[PDB]
């Protein structure tokens, strides 16, 4: 038993962190085959941050303007291009520890591991979800830019995030490994805010299924609901509306625990309305929306404690 936020082991990724320096700015970059990706804002400073122009700021740079370091060793650039919000730097060496990998764009609600890095040197690993407002509740200081987020299937790394910035609310914003931001955000320095966020309904229900799989039941009730009656309740309590695709996704977990979904939505509706009644679910006193259904399947037992 037990249920904890679990990150993927981070070895395969540690082998791809490198330091990238341009003038007076240093940040982490990602080294796959003979390419090294990093935030384009590495080439920037003074007011260069308030009103920049990277097409312009980048043409006034050459390959040897970038000092990519790999441990105490050193890599030389031989090409460079911008891709949307990232630089793609070709280098002389190809990464001996390059894992099988791919690049995907995760959707709000999905989760991934973050490897926090300073100066190309990995310091720590945590799990985080993409928040409906497209930001994450990370833990980064200055120097963390270029730290990446990822999942692992079998032996294959799916990169999905590269860190770029901290919003005024203290939450983070970044991009996939294609350079495209998640959210409306930009790598300028303006009055930007996180749009109001929402609790991830699919996940809370996945969580309650785990509470049951572990073997606790106290939040259940004899009632049921129609999708529609739930969403009317949910909307007020600031939840994302639930849809059929979501309901379908809670399929197997219904099966393994023998509890129908709309029945759990009723449980949920009740928890929203009655509060926790001074006890815990799976150790927590709030409702936990950062576990997906896939995260519950993977970590939880294949058989139920009935």
């Amino acid at each position: 038993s037990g249920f904890r936020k679990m990150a993927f082991p981070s070895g395969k990724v540690e082998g791809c962190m490198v330091q990238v320096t341009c003038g007076t700015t240093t940040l982490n970059g990602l080294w796959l085959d003979d390419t090294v990706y990093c935030p384009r804002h590495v080439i920037c400073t003074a007011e260069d941050m308030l009103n920049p122009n990277y097409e312009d700021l980048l043409i006034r740079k050459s390959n040897h303007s970038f000092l990519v370091q790999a441990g105490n060793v050193q890599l030389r650039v031989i090409g460079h291009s911008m891709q949307n919000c990232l630089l793609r730097l070709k280098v002389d060496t190809s990464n001996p520890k390059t894992p099988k990998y791919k690049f995907v764009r995760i959707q709000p609600g999905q989760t991934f591991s973050v490897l926090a890095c300073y100066n190309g040197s990995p310091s720590g690993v945590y799990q985080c979800a993409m928040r409906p407002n497209h930001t994450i509740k990370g833990s980064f200081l200055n120097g963390s830019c270029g730290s990446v987020g990822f999942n692992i299937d079998y032996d294959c790394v799916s990169f999905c995030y590269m860190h770029h910035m901290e919003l005024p609310t203290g939450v983070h914003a970044g991009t996939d490994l294609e350079g495209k931001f998640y959210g409306p955000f930009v790598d300028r320095q303006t009055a930007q805010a996180a749009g109001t966020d929402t609790t991830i309904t699919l996940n809370v229900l996945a969580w309650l299924y785990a509470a049951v799989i572990n073997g606790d039941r106290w939040f259940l009730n004899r009632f049921t609901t129609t999708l529609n009656d739930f969403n009317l309740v949910a909307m007020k309590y600031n939840y994302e509306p639930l849809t059929q695709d979501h309901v379908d996704i809670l399929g197997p977990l219904s099966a393994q625990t023998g509890i129908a979904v709309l029945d759990m939505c009723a449980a949920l509706k009740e928890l929203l309305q009655n509060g926790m009644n001074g006890r815990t679910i799976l150790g927590s006193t709030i409702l936990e929306d950062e576990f997906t259904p896939f995260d519950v399947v993977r970590q939880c037992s294949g058989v139920t404690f009935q």
Binding site: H41, C44, M49, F140, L141, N142, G143, S144, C145, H163, H164, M165, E166, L167, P168, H172, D187, Q189, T190, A191, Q192
Partner: peptide
């Protein structure tokens, strides 16, 4: 404004 980390 915002911190570009």
């Amino acid at each position: 404004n915002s911190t570009s980390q």
